[PDB]
């Protein structure tokens, strides 16, 4: 079976900027597209299961743990729960000018441990191939690099595919993240037609991904820079404690304070 | 006729009954090859009794 | 299989059968691997797309999956070339199906199927039902020929008996549908209920027959609501086989003992065990009745005690080989109707006549060395005319 | 690490997005359109974007 997790980056600052701009695309339509993708994923098979996470500057919250219109009961419950919870989360939110960058590493950590919990609980008879369909919507924060890299490596070890679906911006950190675990990287330039991209590129599971034509991966610039002025460097002088990429040979690296002996 | 598929070594088993039975003119009417014989329709159930000795 | 059953249908019945509630989902689950993905893709498109795209949308490796899926779904007629947009009705129904618009039961099903099999075999005590008896008789696995005397069991009956419960029930329901069309019950309406289970007068009669089979049980004096059993949606062994053709079966239900006695000689019957011997007499008796060694071997393997599961193979080679050799020992006569010509003159002329009886379906055996073609009397008035025409052509 | 790189705007965006989603479940027609879907398929075509 397959356990899909949609990590939606519903950043109020950026999505409300779109709302003020009165652009055609809106967070409501984005949530509807994600809902349709999840419904289709579960539609694929009974054993398949899904979950949803929404990201905010403060924290990240799960959007998912009759036939009034002649509807499938389970998908109806999914629609109702996600709609109600997303509206509640968006309506209620404190204001903090100091912190405005969208948070994604914590949401991904929650997704990873949730997948681990489900893998533990599920019977050993059936093998579960989990996936994380990250949908970024705003620029990333520099200060989150370390934790995001930790969670990416944990996902690599635990065999989960991070399929990035960044839109309106190309996050180098996120493309690097999905490249490590082999997840696909699609940058949709046509936001209104986003759902067609999901039902082709992302929706097919790892089982059938190899035996299918999908957009080629984007080249990843594995840049390195010294800790002084933040610029690309091809040669780094790291020590045996900090393991920090530096500018030039120095008597002692500041982040270490070690008694380096010249020679 | 009645097409009967059999074994090459067993085809001559029904031929011996042809020269022994005096009911009609001739039992086997057309011997196609070694695994196909023909017959007036009437002795398949009787042949099942001879399986105990065959 | 259900794929065969659905493939053997016309477009007119197919589109009607694609009902809104369940059919669009039940037939979807059938899609083995990839056609699911394509159905989801082009579920939201109102514009048909070229076939070349679908052709090139699978890598060079594992293309046979692409062709087989495309052929299967073309047979199902989910889309039309229109020049590959899906059928509008199926698209709408599938969108409506995708975000749009027990312990006693299993025992009941087991007991009902067991009593049905008891009646199938010559059990003096069994459930009595004239409709069930006549249905089984017309299913092709039973023939009575005398209403006063209880019906006997035909050759196909033993083969059906020795099959496993899943395949047995599935084939029984397939025959049920085929005979439903003959008796006049609408096929689509009854078929849709089976799909709806895994999630009118004709409906009531069909549900009554299903309850008689034990798949469903209203439990409320035949109320509208029903609670399907496990078998409606669609175990350890007990026989121990020795190397001396001896079977020790931990059987308490008389059905298993009867099934074993069908092809073995019973020696002792203990309260929780029974001893039988697989001898030439019993095995050849079963083979004459109609069974073949494959069914017996499969039955013994599936009902294999856990003790003998450790050894590989589970069933001893000596027992398996002996059963196969015993079945081979018997080769049997056949029955057909035919007429034979002779004095065929030219050789190249006899080869043209062989294609006349082969296309019409009246040819049985040919002989190019003696010129000897057997023609059934059913098509004798058509072959002779052709021969006369050939003679006229000269 | 080495990876490289008004106030009233946040208030305006927050209130606007709060008022955005008073209506939900527009999936019937709003989420997708055939013309946009066809454009997406053409883009996914080898010669497309
Ligand atoms: Zn520097
Ligand atoms: Zn250091």
Burial of A233 (0-12, 13-18, 19+ CB in 10 A): middle
Chains with ≥3 CB–CB distances under 8 Å to C: A, B, D
CA distance C12 to chain A (A): 25
Least CB-CB distance to D37: which of C45, C99, C100? C45
Q: Does A77 touch chain C (CB under 8 A)?
A: no
In this structure, what token pair is assigned to residue A65? Answer: 């743990």
**Cβ-based contacts of D34 with chain C (< 8 Å):** 45-47
Q: Using CA atoms in the order B25, B28, B32, B36, what is the torsion angle rounded to 10 degrees?
A: 160
In this structure, what token pair is assigned to residue C185? Answer: 């019950």
Which residue is listed with tokens 């059913």?
C378
Burial of C70-103, coded b for 16+ CB within 10 Å and e otherwise, reads: bebbeebbbbeeeebbbbeebbebbbbbbbbeee
Chains with ≥3 CB–CB distances under 8 Å to D: A, C
- Name the strand (E) or helix (H) holding B36: strand B36-37
Number of domains in chain B: 1
- Helix, strand or coil, per DSSP, at residue C368: coil
DSSP one-letter code for A139: P
Test B3 with C340 for CB contact under 8 angstroms: no
Least CB-CB distance to A35: which of C56, C61, C99? C99
- Name the strand (E) or helix (H) holding A111: helix A105-121
In this structure, what token pair is assigned to residue A113? Answer: 């441990």
Q: How many CB atoms lie within 10 A of CB B15?
A: 13
- Helix, strand or coil, per DSSP, at residue C79: strand
- Helix, strand or coil, per DSSP, at residue C130: helix
Q: How many CB atoms lie within 10 A of CB A111?
A: 26
Chains with ≥3 CB–CB distances under 8 Å to A: C, D
Report CA(A179)–ligand 2 centroid distance (Å).
29
Q: Which of D6, D7, D21 to mutate to test the interface with A (most CBs of A within 10 A)?
A: D21
Angle between helices C380-393 and C347-360 (to 10 degrees): 150
Q: Enter the resolution in angstroms.
A: 5.5
User: Distance between CA A39 and CA A75 in Å, rounded?
Assistant: 6
Q: Which residues pair with A161 in a beta bridge?
A: A131
Going by C-alpha positions, the residue among C94, C85, C31, D36 that lies closest to residue A36 is C94
User: Distance between CA C94 and CA C88 in Å, rounded?
Assistant: 10
In this structure, what token pair is assigned to residue A221? Answer: 């610039």
Instruction: Provide the chain C residues 258-297 that lie in CB contact (below 8 A) with chain B.
Output: 288
User: Distance between CA A169 and CA A9 in Å, rounded?
Assistant: 12
User: Distance between CA C169 and CA C314 in Å, rounded?
Assistant: 26
Is there a contact between C226 and C52 (Cβ–Cβ < 8 Å)?
no
**Cβ-based contacts of B41 with chain C (< 8 Å):** 335
User: Distance between CA C320 and CA C313 in Å, rounded?
Assistant: 10
Test A212 with C57 for CB contact under 8 angstroms: yes
User: Distance between CA C377 and CA A15 in Å, rounded?
Assistant: 83
- Across C304-369, where does the E strand assignment appear? 339-340
Check residue C140 and give left, alpha or beta (phi > 0: left; psi -120 to 50: alpha).
left
Pick the ligand that lies closest to the CA of residue A236.
1
Going by C-alpha positions, the residue among C175, C179, C199, C180 that lies closest to residue C190 is C180
In sequence order, the 6+-apart residues with CB closer than 8 A to the CB of A187 are A166, A167, A170, A218
DSSP one-letter code for A57: S
The half-sphere exposure of C195 on its side-chain side, counting CA atoms within 13 A, is 23
Domain that holds residue B45: 1-54
Cis preceding-peptide flag for A45 (omega within 30 of 0): no
CA distance D38 to chain C (A): 7
Test C338 with B10 for CB contact under 8 angstroms: no
Q: Does D28 touch chain A (CB under 8 A)?
A: no
Comparing alpha-carbon positions, the chain B residue that sits nearest to C371 is B32
DSSP one-letter code for C137: I
Is there a contact between A93 and D21 (Cβ–Cβ < 8 Å)?
no
In sequence order, the 6+-apart residues with CB closer than 8 A to the CB of C373 are C340, C341, C350, C353, C354, C357, C363, C365, C366, C367
User: Experimental method used, please?
Assistant: cryo-EM
Going by C-alpha positions, the residue among C90, C81, C91 that lies closest to residue C52 is C81
DSSP one-letter code for C86: B
Test A212 with C59 for CB contact under 8 angstroms: yes
Report CA(A143)–ligand 2 centroid distance (Å).
20
In this structure, what token pair is assigned to residue C171? Answer: 């084939």
**Cβ-based contacts of C99 with chain D (< 8 Å):** 27
Distances (CA, A) of D43 to A35, A188, C58: 24, 10, 17
User: Distance between CA A94 and CA C291 in Å, rounded?
Assistant: 78
In this structure, what token pair is assigned to residue C169? Answer: 């029930």
DSSP one-letter code for C176: H
Q: Which residues pair with A126 in a beta bridge?
A: none
Report CA(A244)–ligand 2 centroid distance (Å).
7
Distances (CA, A) of A86 to A23, A60, A104: 21, 11, 17
In sequence order, the 6+-apart residues with CB closer than 8 A to the CB of A162 are A108, A132, A134, A152, A155, A177, A178, A181, A183
User: Distance between CA C249 and CA C262 in Å, rounded?
Assistant: 14
Going by C-alpha positions, the residue among C260, C251, C294 that lies closest to residue C279 is C260
Going by C-alpha positions, the residue among A166, A11, A16 that lies closest to residue A100 is A11
What count of residues does chain B have? Answer: 54
Distances (CA, A) of C95 to A71, B33, C26, C98, C100: 10, 64, 14, 5, 6
User: Distance between CA C183 and CA A32 in Å, rounded?
Assistant: 49
What's the CATH code of the domain at B29?
Answer: 3.30.70.1220
Least CB-CB distance to C331: which of B6, B30, B38? B6
DSSP one-letter code for A210: T
One DSSP character per residue, C331-368 reads --------EE------HHHHHHHHHHHHHHT-B----T
What is the bridge-based pairing of β-strands A3-8 and A131-135? parallel
- Helix, strand or coil, per DSSP, at residue A249: coil
Going by C-alpha positions, the residue among A70, A140, A58, A147 that lies closest to residue A108 is A147
Going by C-alpha positions, the residue among C371, C360, D10, C141 that lies closest to residue A12 is D10
The half-sphere exposure of C313 on its side-chain side, counting CA atoms within 13 A, is 14
Test A190 with D7 for CB contact under 8 angstroms: no
One DSSP character per residue, C178-243 reads HHHHHHT--HHHHHHHHHHHT--HHHHHHHHHHHHHTSEE--SSS-S--EE-HHHH-----EEE-T
Test A39 with C99 for CB contact under 8 angstroms: yes
Task: Please state whether at least 3 CB pairs lie below 8 Å between chains A and B.
Answer: no
* CA B7 to the chain's CA centroid: 11
Burial of A188 (0-12, 13-18, 19+ CB in 10 A): buried
Pick the ligand that lies closest to the CA of residue A241.
2
Report CA(A262)–ligand 2 centroid distance (Å).
14
User: Distance between CA B2 and CA B5 in Å, rounded?
Assistant: 10
Test D14 with A192 for CB contact under 8 angstroms: no
The half-sphere exposure of A70 on its side-chain side, counting CA atoms within 13 A, is 11
Burial of A134 (0-12, 13-18, 19+ CB in 10 A): buried
Report CA(A228)–ligand 2 centroid distance (Å).
14
Q: Does D40 touch chain A (CB under 8 A)?
A: yes
* φ, ψ at A221 (rounded to 5°): -95, 95
Q: Does D38 touch chain A (CB under 8 A)?
A: no
Which residue is listed with tokens 């075509």?
D45
User: Distance between CA A12 and CA A55 in Å, rounded?
Assistant: 9
Comparing alpha-carbon positions, the chain A residue that sits nearest to C24 is A43
User: Distance between CA A184 and CA A218 in Å, rounded?
Assistant: 9
């Amino acid at each position: 079976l397959n356990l899909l997790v949609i990590v939606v980056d519903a950043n109020p600052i950026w999505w409300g900027k779109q709302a003020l701009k009165e652009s055609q695309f809106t967070l409501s339509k984005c949530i509807d597209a994600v809902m349709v993708l999840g419904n289709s994923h579960l539609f694929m098979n009974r054993s398949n299961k899904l979950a949803v996470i929404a990201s905010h500057i403060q924290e990240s919250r799960f959007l998912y743990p009759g036939s009034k219109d002649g509807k499938y009961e389970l998908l109806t419950s999914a629609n109702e729960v996600i709609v109600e919870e997303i509206k509640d989360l968006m309506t209620k939110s404190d204001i903090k000018g100091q912190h405005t960058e969208t948070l994604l590493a914590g949401s991904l950590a929650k997704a990873l441990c949730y997948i681990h919990r489900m893998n533990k609980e599920v019977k050993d008879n059936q093998e579960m191939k989990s996936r994380i369909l990250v949908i970024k919507a705003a620029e990333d924060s520099a200060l989150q690099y370390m934790n995001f890299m930790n969670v990416i490596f944990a996902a690599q070890k635990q065999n989960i595919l991070i399929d990035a679906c960044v839109l309106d911006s190309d996050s180098g950190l996120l493309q690097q993240a999905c490249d490590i675990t082999g997840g696909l990287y699609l940058k949709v330039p046509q936001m209104p037609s986003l759902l067609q991209y999901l039902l082709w590129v992302f929706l097919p599971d790892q089982d059938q991904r190899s035996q299918l034509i999908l957009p080629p991966p984007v080249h990843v610039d594995y840049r390195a820079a010294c800790f002084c002025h933040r610029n690309l460097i091809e040669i780094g002088y790291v020590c045996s404690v900090c393991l920090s990429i530096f500018c030039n040979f120095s008597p002692i690296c500041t982040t270490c304070e070690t008694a380096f002996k010249i020679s | 006729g009645v097409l009967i598929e059999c074994d090459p070594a067993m085809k001559q088993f029904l031929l011996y009954l042809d020269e022994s039975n005096a009911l009609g003119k001739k039992f086997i009417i057309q011997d196609i090859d070694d695994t196909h014989v023909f017959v007036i329709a009437e002795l398949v159930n009787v042949l099942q009794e001879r399986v105990g000795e065959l | 299989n259900l794929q065969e059953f659905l493939g053997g249908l016309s477009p007119g019945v197919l589109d009607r059968l694609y009902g809104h509630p369940a059919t669009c989902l039940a037939v979807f689950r059938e899609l083995p691997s990839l056609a699911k993905n394509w159905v989801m893709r082009m579920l939201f498109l109102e514009q048909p797309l070229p076939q070349a795209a679908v052709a090139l949308w699978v890598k060079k490796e594992f293309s046979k999956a692409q062709e087989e899926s495309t052929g299967l779904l073309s047979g199902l007629r989910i889309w039309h070339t229109q020049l590959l947009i899906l059928n509008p009705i199926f698209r709408q129904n599938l969108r409506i199906a995708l975000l749009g618009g027990v312990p006693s039961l299993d025992k009941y099903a087991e007991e009902r199927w067991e009593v049905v099999l008891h009646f199938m075999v010559g059990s003096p005590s069994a459930a009595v039902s004239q409709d069930l008896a006549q249905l089984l008789s017309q299913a092709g696995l039973m023939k009575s020929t005398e209403p006063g005397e209880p019906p006997c069991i035909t050759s196909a009956g033993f083969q059906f008996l020795l099959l496993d419960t899943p395949a047995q029930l599935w084939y029984f329901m397939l025959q049920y549908l085929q005979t439903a069309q003959s008796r006049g019950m609408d096929l689509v309406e009854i078929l849709s209920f089976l799909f709806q289970l895994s999630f009118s007068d004709s409906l009531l009669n069909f549900l009554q027959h299903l309850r008689e089979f034990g798949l469903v049980f209203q439990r409320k004096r035949k109320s509208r609501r029903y609670y399907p059993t496990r078998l409606a949606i669609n175990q350890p062994g007990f026989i121990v086989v020795e190397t001396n053709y001896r079977l020790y079966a931990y059987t308490e239900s008389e059905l298993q003992i009867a099934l074993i006695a069908l092809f073995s000689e019973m020696l002792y019957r203990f309260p929780n065990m029974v001893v039988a011997q697989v001898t030439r007499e019993s095995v050849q008796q079963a083979i004459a009745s109609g069974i073949t060694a494959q069914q017996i071997i499969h039955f013994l393997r599936t009902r294999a005690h856990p003790v003998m599961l450790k050894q590989t193979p589970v069933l001893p080679p000596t027992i398996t080989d002996q059963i196969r050799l015993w079945e081979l020992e018997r080769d049997r006569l056949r029955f057909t109707e035919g007429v034979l010509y002779n004095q065929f003159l030219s050789q190249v002329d006899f080869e043209l006549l062989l294609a006349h009886a082969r296309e019409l379906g009246v040819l049985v055996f040919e002989n190019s060395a003696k010129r000897l073609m057997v023609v059934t009397p059913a098509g004798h008035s058509d072959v002779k005319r052709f021969w006369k025409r050939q003679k006229h052509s000269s | 690490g080495p990876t490289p790189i008004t106030s009233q705007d946040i208030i305006n965006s927050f209130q606007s997005i709060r008022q955005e989603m008073e209506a939900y479940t527009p999936k019937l027609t709003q989420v997708l359109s055939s013309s946009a879907a066809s454009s997406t398929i053409t883009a996914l075509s080898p010669g497309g974007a």
